[PDB]
Symmetry: D2
Subunit: 220 residues, 4 copies
């Protein structure tokens, strides 16, 4: 499962541990019980969600491989209850890959210049900065220092391991109109994968705990 | 990474319920920083020892385990102090607890010259435990709320819980519990955890024991 | 500031860093007068912006029964240091519920009688403990016969945001009555040190019930 | 206490709870005696008993380039609040390495030339940013053309234990030079408020190299 986001980004599911039944089992232990039947365990997940019993969902875990603009990764990395490993700018020569907003991105705003022109000015800086970047490196300048001229729309990559509860906290904040449109798109891809792996939890989440808005109108 | 079970103490156990990833999971995560991926067994295994040597612990957070543990409360209280993990435990306020208590064996006193025979100690612990539990059943039978009746049950009462923890946090756990300074009872559980860890992540475990393990019993 | 809880417990403030203004200042980095500042706090509280409150921290000294502490310690976003039963000799102090504790419940055994059976078990258990210790049994082993109502003490450092999460879960009728009592005390001290943040909490974020009543 | 770092940054102490005795009170779980207390602090540090130190907490106000903040924010056991490029118009403040930053490296061009090149692109990027803003382009979007050396500001609340882990990782020759500088400033303030913990830290637990060199 690899979903393309923006012009060169993506969200890819690397691994997963457990499913909806992992949470049912975890929660049953409190009552010294185990699993029962579909409509029973399905009903439990709904009960847990509607009453704020979040811990059982911590037993479901995902590992994603994500490609995204640094300005997006900076917001993303603010989520502390998860694990990260990202491409290093001091240890690797960075690739010429930047997020160039589509002209449609400015749709809904009165601008003095045409969207196409905006798109042009951004690319201009990008090409100029990257050119400066390579020149510095070829001149013997350390990579960790040369990359400081690169803009925030530069694409980075990282692995993200997070449990289902933290993932839902993530969705409440990023799968929402108040978050920047760009990370909203990534949150959609995360939600789609989460739905595929934990349908019962996802549904119960949208129905009883989700606090954002976009997931109620969009599909998957 | 599907199933294993080890019995601890007289009625306890550590059972592996699930696992996500393996040694290569850490290799992949670490390589991303250099914009690379997996290489060969030789180079990849070399990286794991390299990470361990210089204390690059983040890559190992991508390896996750879920255990199902049965242990006495005094052990659980020590265990639960490890904050970077997830738990769900049997509830004394919601369910009727069973007559299961950890009774130390006479050998648990080996090295300690006691006034009364060790067997005597074992017997006296069983006695108090039996009395407390009978009082518990009596209060429950008489309508006393479960959450109140259980307060008379002793610390060696067995409890059960699910524990999800990543490899990095697991190694932190072993540095502290797989050590002669930790209480013997929890050392036993730590040894079982180490056995399952070793089985699921040979390279990581081996590198851990050789370059990072701080304890003295593994 | 100290508050007695149950029959022999307590919660006392040891230290605190910051106040309502600490949250205002931290949130002001993203982008005054009492009016504008307090309005900001209600604004942050209203919209779920919890991070600014993490810059206010408390340290409590708590005395409570182990069964209460076991629930309390499940709150991971905080720091703890508790008395050790394997290193020090344990004191003869247990929580004996008052007869009023079983109020509302129709029990075959009179509430006063229930209270007595608990004290009885506690007494016998503690004697066995001392008996074992004097026989040469190490403390870490002898203490396993002691009941869950044994009192313990610990230091608790927690930020305002985490404290509010604690109040949502423990200052509620669903939580066991015993810990509800401690949560009330915790809330009282929080109110004293952070009135604006506290008022805004009850008004827009607090999910429990008892703080709206008591 | 405010220490300047790099060319336009700084580390400033906003608040602090407790001192060395706070870890002592916590470890004993009670409530003085310098000899005893200091000995205990050393004992704890020597045998890996770090929890008592979580009871000492600092709040800093930091100004640093984004590439530095991105490394800094990787420290999860702490609290942050940072200036937002989505809601605020950003100021023309960037970190321009001095020619001295590249002394010790064989470059095919004079260090001053690297300074000029970095500053030129920075200047062009900012001008575009301003033109985009004036044009009505949203801030959250207009700022994506701004380079990684843009200065940001944030409040950082962290306990002494977590602060020591930060020092271990950042106050070390392996960490990028720029964050090393911030780590030194953090250490000085820490040493100022908790002299006993700091000395015990360097003596028994500190894993980095630089702090045993440059004093305070
Ligand atoms: O929607 C937002 N999400 C987010 O995570 N930040 C955090 C990320 C970073 O630490 C700092 C600056 O963010 P930005 O420039 O994107 O506004 O605040 C800010 C926002 F406005
Ligand atoms: O010394 C380093 N410190 C650090 O915190 N990172 C993290 C920060 C970020 O999440 C990603 C890219 O860092 P950078 O481009 O500065 O190398 O890895 C990388 C290093 F090499
Ligand atoms: O080896 C130990 N491990 C541990 O986790 N504690 C913590 C657990 C509990 O929260 C409190 C009292 O522990 P105990 O009575 O087992 O000594 O301190 C204490 C020890 F001595
Ligand atoms: O209201 C509760 N609060 C709580 O923190 N637990 C946790 C504490 C402990 O880890 C385990 C057993 O709790 P208890 O026996 O008090 O029900 O579950 C359980 C409850 F029912």
């Amino acid at each position: 499962m690899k979903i393309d986001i923006l012009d060169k980004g993506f969200v890819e599911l690397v691994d997963v541990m457990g499913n909806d039944l992992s949470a049912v089992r975890a929660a049953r232990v409190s009552f010294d019980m185990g699993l029962k039947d579909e409509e029973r365990d399905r009903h439990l997940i709904e009960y847990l969600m509607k009453h704020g019993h979040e811990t059982p969902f911590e037993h479901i875990v995902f590992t994603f491989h994500v490609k995204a603009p640094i300005f997006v990764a900076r917001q993303w990395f603010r989520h502390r209850i998860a694990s990260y490993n990202e491409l290093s700018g001091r240890y690797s020569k960075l690739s010429y890959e930047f997020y160039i907003p589509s002209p449609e991105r400015l749709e809904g705003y009165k601008t003095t210049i045409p969207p196409e022109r905006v798109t042009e000015k951004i690319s201009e800086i990008v090409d100029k900065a990257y050119r400066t970047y390579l020149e510095l490196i070829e001149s013997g300048v350390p990579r960790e220092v040369a990359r400081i001229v690169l803009p925030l729309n530069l694409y980075t990559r990282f692995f993200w391991t997070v449990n289902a509860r933290s993932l839902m906290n993530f969705l409440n904040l990023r799968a929402d109109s108040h978050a920047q449109w760009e990370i909203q798109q990534y949150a959609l891809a995360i939600a789609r994968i989460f739905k595929e792996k934990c349908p019962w939890t996802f549904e119960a989440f949208l129905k009883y705990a989700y606090k954002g808005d976009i997931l109620k109108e969009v599909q998957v």
